Amino acid sequence: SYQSLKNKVVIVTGAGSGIGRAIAKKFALNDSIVVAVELLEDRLNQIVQELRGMGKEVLGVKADVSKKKDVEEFVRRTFETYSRIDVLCNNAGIMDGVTPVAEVSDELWERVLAVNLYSAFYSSRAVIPIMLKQGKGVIVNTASIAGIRGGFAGAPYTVAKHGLIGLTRSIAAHYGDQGIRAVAVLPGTVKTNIGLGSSKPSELGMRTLTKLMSLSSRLAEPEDIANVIVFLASDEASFVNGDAVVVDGGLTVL
Template identity: 45%
Template structure:
C-alpha cells in the first residue's frame, strides 16, 4: 500500500538532481507533488514526467514574494501541504574565509539558508492548521564539518542544521517533524557551471578525496522519503548523514 496516498509534497530544487529524485520517489509512493525550481522549464519537465499527480511552479526561494506565490499555488491546486522537502541550493566557489567575496557570501546564504527559512516560514501555518506534517531539509556533509566546502556553503549548511533543530523543537507538540539529510558526494549538476577558487580547492582536496564514493540522487531521495513517512513518526530533529560512511571516519 502506498504510504503517501492523499498527501501533498512540495519539493524545491525539483527540476534536477536530488530534488527531481525526491519528486519521483514521493509520486511513486502515492503523493501529489508541487515541483518547484528556479528554472521553470526544468520544473515543467519534471512535472510532465510525473503526469497528472504534479504541478510545476517556477520560483526563486530567496525571494519572499516568490515563495508566497509558490505556497499559494500549492494550496490553490491541492488544498494542503503535508510534506516539505527544502532541497534547493547552490554551491560556492570553495573560497576560504579570507578570499571569499561578500557578494558570493550573501548570495549563497540567501539561497541555501534564508531560502530554506522562507519556504519553511510560509508552509508552517498550513501545517499548523492541519495539525501536523513533515519537513525534510537537505543540508550537507559540509553542515557538520569545516573542510567539505568553501566558507559560504559551509556556513549556510551549518545554518540549515540549526534551523532544522529549531523547527523540530518548536513544533514537536504540534505534530510537525523536521529532520535533515546530509548528502555526501552525489551525482548532480549543482557544480556544473561553478568556477572554483584554486587556493580553496587545493586546501579542501584532501578532505574531499575521503568522500570518493559517489551516491545516486535516488539514494538521497529514499532517505527523505523515510524521514517524511509514518515509519519515522518519532524521529524529529535528526541530522542524518547519507554519505556512505564518510562522516564516520
Template identity: 50%
Template sequence: MRFEQQVALVTGAASGIGRALVQRFVTEGAAVVAVDIVEAPLKALVTELELQGAKVTACVANVASDNDVEAMLTTATSTYGRLDILCNNAGIMDLMTPAADVPLDLWERVLAINLNGPFLACRRAIPLFLEQGSGSIVNTASEAGLRGGSAGTAYTVSKHGVVGLTKSIAFHYGERGIRCNAVCPGSVATAIGAGSGTPHEAGLSRVMPFIQGSAPSRIAAPEEIAAAIAFLASKDAGYLNGAILPVDGGWFAA
C-alpha cells in the same frame, strides 16, 4: 503506498536530488508541487510524469524571494487543498572560497538560497501545518553542515545554518505535530558544481586532500539521497524529530 492522499512540495526539483525526490514521491502516491527557478527542465519533468498519470504541478519560483515562496505555498493549497510535506532542497555551491576571499555578492547569494530559502518556506509552511495538526519538513543540508573542511566558508556556514534551523523547528513545534529533520549528503552525482564558475584555487587545493582522504570512494546516486529524504518525510520516521542524518556512505563516521 506511503504517501497516498498526501501533498509534498519539493524545491530544486528540476535536477539532481530534487528531481529524484519528485519521482520517488509520485511513485509512492503523493501529489507533488515541483519548484525550481529554471523553467524548461522543470516543465519537461512535470510533463513526463503527467503522461504517466502522476499528480504533479510545476511552479517556477526563486526560494530566496519571499513573494515567490508565498506563491509556491499557495500553489500547493490552491491546487491540492493542503500541504503535508515540505522538502527544502534547492541549493548552490560556493567555489570552495575561504572566508577572507569570499566576495560579498557570493556570500549573500549562497546564504540567500541555501539558508534564507529554507527559513522563508518553513516560516510560511508552519502555520499551515499547525492548522492541520501535522506536517513534515525535510531540509537538505550537507556533509558541509557537519564539518569545516568539505566546502568554502559561505556554503559551510549556510549548511550549518540549515542544521540549526532544523533543530530549532523540531524543538519549538514538535509537540504540536510538526517534525523537522535534515539529511546531510556526502558526494552525490548531480549538476551542482557545473557552470557555477572557477573554484577558488587555494581553497580547492586545501579542501580536496581532506575530501579525497576521508570520503568513501563511491559517489552516491541522487536516488539514494531521495530515498533517505522520503523516509524522513514519511510516517515510518514518525518518532524522528530534529534528526540530522548523514547520508554519506560512512564519511562522517571516519
C-alpha cells in the same frame, strides 16, 4: 510503497535536477501529489511531464526560492489548489566555489545564504501555520556534511548548511509537540549538476577539498538520497524529529 504518503501534498524545491528530481519521482512513485518548484523553465517542464507520464498529480511552479515573494506565492498557490500542505522538502541549493572566508565577496556571501538558507526560512515560516492547523506536517531540509565539518566546501556554503541544521533543530524543538517534524538529510558526494559553483574554484579551498576526496572513491546517485528523504517524510519515521541524518556512505565517520 509507503501507504502514509498516498495523496499527501508534497512541495519539492529544486525539482528539475539531481536530488530534487529524484525526490519528486520517488514521492510520485508513492502516489503523493507533488508540487515541483524549480528556477529553470525547461528543467521544470521536463520533470512535470515525467510525473504526468507516471500518471500522477503534479503541479509545476517556476520560482526562485531565494525570493520571499516567490516562496510565499507557491505556498499560497499550493494551499489554494490542494487545501493542504503535508510535506515540504527544502532542497534547492547552489555551491560557493569552495571559497574560503578572505576570498568571499559580499555578493557571494549573500547569494549562497539566500538560496541555501533564507529560502528554507521563508518556506518554513509560510508553511508552519498551515501544518499547525492540520495538526501534522513534515519539513525535510537537504543540508550537507558541510553542515557538520569545515573543509567540504567554501565558507558561505558551510555557514549556510550549519545554519540550515540550526533551523531544522529550532523547528523540531518548538513545534514537535504540535504535530510538526523537521529533519535534515546530510549528503556526502552525490552525482548531480551542482558542481563547485565555479569553473575556477578557490585554489586554497580546493587544497582542502582535494585531500578529503582522497578518503573515498564512492559517489552516490541522487536516488540514494531521495530514498532517505521520502522515508523520513512517511509515518514510518513518525518518531524521527530534529535529527541530522548523514547519508554519506561513511565518509564522515572515518
